[PDB]
Amino acid sequence: GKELVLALYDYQEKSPDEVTMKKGDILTLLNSTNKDWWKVEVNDRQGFVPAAYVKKLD
């Protein structure tokens, strides 16, 4: 499994443990154990984004 997610909306980081993404970005999923905040990797940065702002691609 590739563990990819698609950004549904832009998100601006508000804390240093978050990441910024743009709608249409394809992120790597690291940890989806929390229902509200998922840890993702977008290039060379890792951090949290809201789960509701992304969709798992398979």
Swiss-Prot record:
Location of the SH3 domain: 1-58
Subcellular location: Cytoplasm, Cytoskeleton; Cytoplasm, Cell cortex
Domain of life: Eukaryota
Family listed: Belongs to the spectrin family.
Stated role: Morphologically, spectrin-like proteins appear to be related to spectrin, showing a flexible rod-like structure. They can bind actin but seem to differ in their calmodulin-binding activity. In nonerythroid tissues, spectrins, in association with some other proteins, may play an important role in membrane organization.
UniProt subunit comment: Like erythrocyte spectrin, the spectrin-like proteins are capable of forming dimers which can further associate to tetramers. Interacts with ACP1.
Protein name per its UniProtKB record: Spectrin alpha chain, non-erythrocytic 1
